[PDB]
Symmetry: C4
Subunit: 347 residues, 4 copies
């Protein structure tokens, strides 16, 4: 049966569907965008800044936390430098902060230094979360810190979600290949369309009461609404936060216009800092302070929740209905046959 | 339970996904009847309505539209007294037909009072989400005060939303969520329904109530109008195909030696200056007098009805058959492998 | 009742949607026979007909096409006496077979009388909608006056229309509504059927009466012609691939130091001068003598018949099997990921 | 009659239509084995073959390919003795493996005689249509004269064509009609089968006889190679990804300010001096070892995601998931300006 079912499975991505409007008794200004990942970790907005060397550092995680979100300090630095940055964030009013940790031999010594800075969640993020080495590390970390929030990823199947939950992780991160700087699906030929991956993983984690994180693939505020409506509790962003003033990336000039360096953790340049690469090096347009971008994201989420009549996010993921779409409909969803003179804050 | 499992079941079709199949014909395009009835007090010689936008329809536009057999909708982005005078200006010019857009805002009741005293033929209660409870309650409020008034309500995209507006008092339902050429709702909120599916679904519900529907937005060629009418719509509402017309309120400007007219969305930042925007500002080529483009639109409709053998518009929507098509069929339907030297009036 | 529910059931396929599947072959491309028979009085050495357009086929084109084993169609954009002289000129110059297009006007009989006295080999009653009652009555009228004349009727795209023309008196049916490279019928009227589905459906009906069908329009490569013949068509009609030929009526024009020839549709505004157009005016690159492009066309057919093992065209249309493909497969079928250095005769 | 109604029933899938599904893995990419066996006399350390073209594979290319664990195919666009000199020149250094292409012609047997006397390890009977009767009769003719020779026959794309070559005498089947980057067969003749379906269809038939299949043409990224092997192919044959390499026969030219190498199809008008190929240029990519390292490294990454301990576990257990064009846009880098050209992505 394994030979005959090679090409049976089918996947859906963000640009394949649309959210169906339903009866609404709530106004967009009145909806609540709050979400809870655990009793020790509660966010006012479902936005997380990814743990990359060009997205989130001490300055970024602070600005993200002041807005109700969460920042993830990347692991491409020394153990003592990462612990001080976590302490620097917590010093600004005891905000919420996370830190990425790789499945290395010295991971436990890195994790020990982070908990003494009272980090709120660690992220055991790797390219393949369904690996045996990743599962054993989760059992190893959970045994030493029973009350710590453990985020494990990345995965894209329901079987991989269940395996990490049984290893000790209470938060599962979903996404293999949808990143804007990712080339895994081109280099390794491996991947699962995000919207299907989120739906499959959230279905498995929902019967255990485990939240899932939609990580990667979001390029517009509407895609964030689709990810949350597919079963995800929160969304993790990289490209939409890289052009923010608070991000660590370096400023470069292109065509007389400011840009910010945005690289993947699998790029050759990010590798030296930390055999074949699975990411590319690039630049994103400068978008100014973080607060401007966040208002457009939440404002786009409030509009979508108003169309579906969802007062809270849990009503959205439990009731929102999609409609499948062709390629010609995607051009219909975007502005067409009109010369765009002014570029909108959201577009 | 069942709402979670039916997340990705529905399928949607747009204009560029299908084609009308030719059938037995005993009528020539010059002989068909393009007359349509929206109510016993509202009858149009051609099934064309100009949308109520600050860059499409004003007093001058509504006059030329009505003298051509169509209908104009005066936009609401002006004072109540300025809008009532424009309505009177049209009526005074030979007893033509004119409509006016009205929001579910607080000045709707006082605005409708001034419009009905100006002998307006129809009001349009159009909002971003016509399936809202606030919109439904206003329709009951307006219908209770004006039992014989023509009320156009929208916008909707599901059959259940059509039933709700019909049950509230509206005798014409406007269909369209996201297909506007200047619309960004599907990018910002992730919400929308493909037009051809939306029209078919809404018209199916309103057909058992004897209620006509308006295909609003999405039309970029005259053939798109024929598909909308054959899909179940009684009339079609156009915006982008009328903005570059001399009778539109915008003024003609030059960019790169070519004539253009400003075309903005009602949800764009510019229209509201007069939370998160859902429209953009753009440019359309100047198309000369209104009579030129209307002659091309109706002439394209007469040709399409000749191919289908439709003597009436009722025969078209009750008998016309579609055929689904791929993306490669879309490129074959448009001119291909020929460099175009002369720009056609319809193309 | 039932016509409303079957509105979007049908599916159509175009040229770039499929590929011919290789089969067991015992014949070499140099050995296959490309001869086809349309009637006892009309037999072609090659299955190529030049369309009857004022920028494709005139006396010079019909002569060169007939000396190559094909057939030319003199267009009808001239006087009855002008067209009869062109037909006579071809037969006096050595043209073996020649045809002439005739419109469904009141003076059609007077035009046909002059053509048969010029010893025309086939008349073409080509209109936009061959399933019209006026066209059917004209076919019955011509068959009653000339029982032995070769009558080509079109254009149609359904099996229902094919039976009507065959029962009216036509022994050759021409298929194609909307696939022309200069055609805008599907954009202006919204009416059309994908060529490969139309040919297959029409050939299915004409096969039960022993009637050949003509695949007219849509062909842009030699592979598309093989697909048209394998779908059930006896011969193929070309327009854009012959417009840049030296024997075409157009005169060579130069743009940016490169030679061009005018190629316009019969529904374009310019053609009609000599008000709702269904065609556009354009230019195609000059390709030199006709024999060069015909050599590439026939050579491409011989290769395809070799891949399928078809010794005859009748074996090809009766046995060849297709395989359906997505848009990503089309990108593979064309040269990709390599910069093309020289202009190939085929590509 | 029954052939008429099943004209448009079949469906085909290509590389960019699917993705490999990640599975449980207990192995790292550095630990997997990429070795494959085509016959008792033919074993390769890597599943890479350089195609037999006059702008891809020559003596130097076959040496570097063999020293890297792969296999080179000396093309036939040269004299019989010059091709035999190339085969011996390869065997002279390190006693490495080498192959040679042979066309179906009346003088084919004499070309094969010179190659076997040069101790060629496998001959490749490459044609446009491997399901032709003339090709099958040649396979029977060569097998009758050489019982111990490794015979690679192609190209095919259907299960019946695979079965015909196996029963004709070929122990390796070559799959691919129309997917070449320089190929225009599907545009000129309208004939072809999407590679991934063709490989799956051919491998299903060749699996019942213990016969390996070669995924020939269409690969443009390392992920396409991983998909081809997981679909049933034992090895992959490449042309465009090896043509811009320093060991390829072309010399470096500057066109539009960039270094390029000539890459032409065997059916193009230039090689034949009705074409079914075009002449083109690919960027210069330097030494072969760099491009081979990127290809194999991508295979190890893919095999790590699937939990494939060996290549035989990959082709027997890897599962695909189908995707639309919008999912294809998500698979590539998107909405980001690319400043640096990656070794595996360009
Ligand atoms: C037509 C249209 N297309 O975008 C549009 C026109 C003008 C302004 C807007 C803006 C940009 C302001 N966007 C929304 O108004 N977005 C939105 C999103 C979701 C809901 Cl649920 C609602 C509702 N509005 C009401 C009303 F107050 F009208 F009664 C009840 S519910 C509204 C949109
Ligand atoms: C081939 C073609 N493709 O568009 C074409 C060629 C020349 C002119 C036209 C124009 C632009 C004039 N377009 C129509 O003629 N369009 C049209 C549309 C629908 C019908 Cl039903 C009919 C009919 N004409 C007749 C006739 F008078 F011939 F008897 C009977 S029914 C005609 C089209
Ligand atoms: C590989 C390849 N790909 O296109 C190719 C390589 C070189 C030349 C050609 C040319 C341009 C010459 N094209 C054909 O050779 N095209 C073709 C088309 C259909 C058939 Cl059925 C056959 C046959 N070959 C044989 C042989 F005996 F040689 F094997 C018997 S029949 C051949 C193609
Ligand atoms: C997140 C991410 N996305 O691409 C990424 C980040 C940094 C580096 C890489 C590179 C480019 C180095 N690529 C792989 O790391 N590729 C890869 C491919 C296949 C497997 Cl099976 C594994 C595994 N690593 C482990 C470990 F335990 F070491 F963490 C268990 S399994 C890893 C990828
Ligand atoms: O270099 C890499 N290779 C593959 N995936 C990456 C790489 N770097 C970051 N990612 C993933 O991409 C996500 C964010 O991508 P984005 O928000 O879509 O641009 C991260 O949270 C990671 O899961
Ligand atoms: O700014 C806006 N955002 C979203 N939809 C709009 C906006 N302004 C107008 N519309 C709708 O889009 C239609 C325009 O259709 P179109 O120009 O023919 O594509 C209008 O008639 C309204 O129904
Ligand atoms: O102006 C027109 N409008 C629509 N169809 C046309 C027009 N002129 C010619 N045709 C048809 O479209 C075909 C175009 O052939 P092509 O250029 O090979 O695609 C002709 O052979 C006619 O059957
Ligand atoms: O000119 C030709 N016409 C058709 N196919 C060719 C031609 N030359 C090479 N090929 C095929 O294309 C393959 C390599 O193409 P690639 O995908 O660019 O690596 C070869 O192994 C052949 O099967
Ligand atoms: K839109
Ligand atoms: K067309
Ligand atoms: K190709
Ligand atoms: K990607």
């Amino acid at each position: 049966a394994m030979w005959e079912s090679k090409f049976v499975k089918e996947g859906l991505t963000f640009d394949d569907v649309l959210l169906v409007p339903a009866k609404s008794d709530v106004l967009p200004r009145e909806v609540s965008v709050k979400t809870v990942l655990s009793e020790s970790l509660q966010l006012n907005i479902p936005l997380i800044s990814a743990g990359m060397d060009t997205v989130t550092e001490a300055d970024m995680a602070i600005a993200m936390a002041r807005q109700g979100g969460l920042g993830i300090i990347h692991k491409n630095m020394s153990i003592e430098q990462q612990a001080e940055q976590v302490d620097k964030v917590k010093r600004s009013g005891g905000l919420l902060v996370g830190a990425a940790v790789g499945v290395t031999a010295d991971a436990m010594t890195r994790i020990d230094a982070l908990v003494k800075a009272s980090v709120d969640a660690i992220v055991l993020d790797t390219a393949h979360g369904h690996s045996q080495g990743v599962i054993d590390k989760v059992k190893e970390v959970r045994a030493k810190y029973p009350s710590l929030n453990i985020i494990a990823g990345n995965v894209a199947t329901a079987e991989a979600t269940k395996a990490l939950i049984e290893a000790g992780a209470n938060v599962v991160k979903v996404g293999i290949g949808p990143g804007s700087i990712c080339t895994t699906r081109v280099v390794a030929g491996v991947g699962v369309p995000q919207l299907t991956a989120v739906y499959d993983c959230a279905t498995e984690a929902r019967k255990h009461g485990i939240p899932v994180i939609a990580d990667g693939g979001i390029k517009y505020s509407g895609d964030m609404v689709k990810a949350l409506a597919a079963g995800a509790h929160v969304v993790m962003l990289g490209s939409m936060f890289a052009g923010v003033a608070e991000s660590p990336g370096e400023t470069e000039i292109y065509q007389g216009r400011q840009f910010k360096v945005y690289r993947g953790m699998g790029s050759v340049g990010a590798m030296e800092k930390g055999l074949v690469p699975e990411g590319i090096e690039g630049r994103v347009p400068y978008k100014g302070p973080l607060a401007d971008t966040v208002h457009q994201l939440v404002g786009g989420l409030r509009a979508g929740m108003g169309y579906c009549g969802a007062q809270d996010l849990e009503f959205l993921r439990e009731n929102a209905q999609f409609i499948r779409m062709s390629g010609a409909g995607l051009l219909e969803s975007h502005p067409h046959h009109v010369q765009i003179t002014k570029e909108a804050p959201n577009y």
